[PDB]
Design a protein around this ligand. Structure first.
Ligand SMILES: [Zn+2]
Ligand SMILES: [Zn+2]
Ligand SMILES: [Zn+2]
Ligand SMILES: [Zn+2]
Length: 78
């Protein structure tokens, strides 16, 4: 389930941020490592929301720092 979620999270991030999948690890920080900006994450989250059929709080968005954070947030909602 984590491996499923993480694989799909990684493809979406790679497709939309333009980075190579080899750079998308559990420990990668969206901004610092993968080159995103503070605007990119809300579109990513909505894409994850529609991908897995979950939704996230706007309050819980300020805590999301790494790829692993996204996966874990998704994994807990399902
Ligand atoms: Zn792949
Ligand atoms: Zn895709
Ligand atoms: Zn979107
Ligand atoms: Zn898909």
């Amino acid at each position: 389930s984590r491996e499923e979620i993480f694989s799909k999270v990684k493809s979406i991030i790679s497709e939309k941020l333009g980075v190579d999948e080899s750079q998308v690890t559990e420990e990668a920080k969206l901004i610092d490592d993968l080159g995103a900006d503070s605007l990119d994450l809300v579109d990513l989250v909505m894409d994850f929301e529609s991908e897995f059929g979950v939704k996230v709080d706007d309050a819980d968005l300020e805590k999301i720092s790494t790829v692993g954070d996204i996966v874990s947030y998704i994994e807990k909602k399902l």
